[PDB]
Design an enzyme around this catalytic site. Structure first.
Site, PDB file in Angstrom:
ATOM      1  N   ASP B  25       0.779  -1.220   0.000  1.00 52.25           N
ATOM      2  CA  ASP B  25       0.000   0.000   0.000  1.00 52.25           C
ATOM      3  C   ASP B  25       0.816   1.278   0.000  1.00 52.25           C
ATOM      4  O   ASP B  25       1.251   1.777   1.036  1.00 52.25           O
ATOM      5  CB  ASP B  25      -0.876  -0.060   1.247  1.00 52.25           C
ATOM      6  CG  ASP B  25      -1.957   0.977   1.267  1.00 52.25           C
ATOM      7  OD1 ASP B  25      -1.939   1.863   0.354  1.00 52.25           O
ATOM      8  OD2 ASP B  25      -2.845   0.921   2.147  1.00 52.25           O
ATOM      9  N   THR B  26       1.054   1.829  -1.206  1.00 51.36           N
ATOM     10  CA  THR B  26       1.842   3.036  -1.313  1.00 51.36           C
ATOM     11  C   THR B  26       1.170   4.263  -0.719  1.00 51.36           C
ATOM     12  O   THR B  26       1.844   5.262  -0.460  1.00 51.36           O
ATOM     13  CB  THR B  26       2.176   3.326  -2.783  1.00 51.36           C
ATOM     14  OG1 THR B  26       0.983   3.472  -3.550  1.00 51.36           O
ATOM     15  CG2 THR B  26       3.014   2.212  -3.409  1.00 51.36           C
ATOM     16  N   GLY B  27      -0.119   4.197  -0.473  1.00 54.21           N
ATOM     17  CA  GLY B  27      -0.844   5.253   0.201  1.00 54.21           C
ATOM     18  C   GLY B  27      -0.869   5.214   1.699  1.00 54.21           C
ATOM     19  O   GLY B  27      -1.461   6.068   2.360  1.00 54.21           O
TER      20      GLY B  27
HETATM   21  C1  065 Z   1      -6.719   1.153   4.047  1.00 56.89           C
HETATM   22  C2  065 Z   1      -6.746   0.702   2.600  1.00 56.89           C
HETATM   23  C3  065 Z   1      -7.166  -0.772   2.515  1.00 56.89           C
HETATM   24  C4  065 Z   1      -7.750   1.536   1.783  1.00 56.89           C
HETATM   25  N1  065 Z   1      -7.445   2.948   1.712  1.00 56.89           N
HETATM   26  C5  065 Z   1      -6.302   3.336   0.903  1.00 56.89           C
HETATM   27  C6  065 Z   1      -5.081   3.664   1.765  1.00 56.89           C
HETATM   28  O1  065 Z   1      -3.902   3.799   0.982  1.00 56.89           O
HETATM   29  C7  065 Z   1      -5.241   4.897   2.647  1.00 56.89           C
HETATM   30  C8  065 Z   1      -5.166   6.220   1.882  1.00 56.89           C
HETATM   31  C9  065 Z   1      -5.335   7.402   2.825  1.00 56.89           C
HETATM   32  C10 065 Z   1      -4.297   8.259   3.137  1.00 56.89           C
HETATM   33  C11 065 Z   1      -4.438   9.321   4.026  1.00 56.89           C
HETATM   34  C12 065 Z   1      -5.646   9.548   4.632  1.00 56.89           C
HETATM   35  C13 065 Z   1      -6.692   8.702   4.327  1.00 56.89           C
HETATM   36  C14 065 Z   1      -6.562   7.645   3.433  1.00 56.89           C
HETATM   37  N2  065 Z   1      -4.158   4.885   3.614  1.00 56.89           N
HETATM   38  C15 065 Z   1      -4.287   4.745   4.929  1.00 56.89           C
HETATM   39  O2  065 Z   1      -5.366   4.590   5.518  1.00 56.89           O
HETATM   40  O3  065 Z   1      -3.108   4.809   5.582  1.00 56.89           O
HETATM   41  C16 065 Z   1      -3.184   4.790   7.008  1.00 56.89           C
HETATM   42  C17 065 Z   1      -1.988   3.942   7.457  1.00 56.89           C
HETATM   43  O4  065 Z   1      -0.826   4.787   7.303  1.00 56.89           O
HETATM   44  C18 065 Z   1      -1.241   6.112   7.583  1.00 56.89           C
HETATM   45  O5  065 Z   1      -0.738   6.960   6.544  1.00 56.89           O
HETATM   46  C19 065 Z   1      -1.827   7.424   5.776  1.00 56.89           C
HETATM   47  C20 065 Z   1      -3.070   7.382   6.680  1.00 56.89           C
HETATM   48  C21 065 Z   1      -2.763   6.162   7.550  1.00 56.89           C
HETATM   49  S1  065 Z   1      -8.737   3.963   1.677  1.00 56.89           S
HETATM   50  O6  065 Z   1      -8.222   5.327   1.567  1.00 56.89           O
HETATM   51  O7  065 Z   1      -9.529   3.647   2.894  1.00 56.89           O
HETATM   52  C22 065 Z   1      -9.737   3.615   0.277  1.00 56.89           C
HETATM   53  C23 065 Z   1      -9.443   4.202  -0.941  1.00 56.89           C
HETATM   54  C24 065 Z   1     -10.134   3.845  -2.089  1.00 56.89           C
HETATM   55  C25 065 Z   1     -11.128   2.898  -1.983  1.00 56.89           C
HETATM   56  C26 065 Z   1     -11.458   2.344  -0.750  1.00 56.89           C
HETATM   57  C27 065 Z   1     -10.766   2.704   0.402  1.00 56.89           C
HETATM   58  O8  065 Z   1     -12.518   1.492  -0.929  1.00 56.89           O
HETATM   59  C28 065 Z   1     -12.807   1.512  -2.277  1.00 56.89           C
HETATM   60  O9  065 Z   1     -11.924   2.357  -2.945  1.00 56.89           O
END
Ligand code: 065
Ligand code: CL
Ligand code: CL
Ligand code: NA
Lengths: 99, 99
Positions: B25-27
């Site tokens: 997960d690059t995000g």
């Molecule tokens: C958690 C994963 C399975 C899903 N997420 C994408 C992530 O990349 C998300 C993307 C994200 C990034 C920032 C804020 C919110 C979401 N990152 C995230 O939650 O990271 C958390 C862990 O490390 C911390 O750094 C970033 C926030 C924390 S998401 O944003 O909830 C998401 C995006 C598109 C989607 C979805 C869910 O369901 C359908 O399409």
């Protein structure tokens, strides 16, 4: 390009005539953008992540330019804390994870 | 390897002698895994995702194998809906995004 992951992989996109910053996010199935207007029809959707679900508007056949690369697909619009380019559009620009 | 994004980028990880499935997960800045037992002390952390913030337990200097690559670093444990390997460990395995 080759983007390292020491920092968040943020890029400039163009969507709906607007420039925005967005995260290239391999963990996102879908592309999710903060509140904006887009043309055409939409339907409601719920999407879930860490923290739970948010309600979004689903717009189909939206063109987005991502770091200079044009793609078309579905864009979800709603109260996301970060704009994310998900796999539905990453595929179209030929993005891969390499190690 | 070179991983395309037509499907979720799921890999096998090994942590505490147990195999689990996790999303590259690059995000994600951080690595977040579902409830499990880890050794040592933990520290509190709050992380913010699409649906809001959650509390997790932060364990430092944890040995974890990711797709056959050895990493040693911080693992957050909490009510994540999927195990996510974030940039803190993607960098340790040499991962890049390419397009
Ligand atoms: C958690 C994963 C399975 C899903 N997420 C994408 C992530 O990349 C998300 C993307 C994200 C990034 C920032 C804020 C919110 C979401 N990152 C995230 O939650 O990271 C958390 C862990 O490390 C911390 O750094 C970033 C926030 C924390 S998401 O944003 O909830 C998401 C995006 C598109 C989607 C979805 C869910 O369901 C359908 O399409
Ligand atoms: Cl799509
Ligand atoms: Cl391809
Ligand atoms: Na449309």
């Amino acid at each position: 390009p080759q983007i390292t992951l020491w920092k968040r992989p943020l890029v400039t996109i163009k969507i709906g005539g607007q420039l925005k910053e967005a995260l290239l996010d391999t963990g996102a199935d879908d592309t999710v953008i903060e509140e904006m207007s887009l043309p055409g029809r939409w339907k409601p959707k719920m999407i879930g992540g860490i923290g739970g679900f948010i309600k979004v508007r689903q717009y189909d056949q939206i063109i987005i330019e991502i770091a200079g690369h044009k793609a078309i697909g579905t864009v979800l619009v709603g109260p996301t804390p970060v704009n994310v380019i998900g796999r539905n559009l990453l595929t179209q620009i030929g993005a891969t994870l390499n190690f």
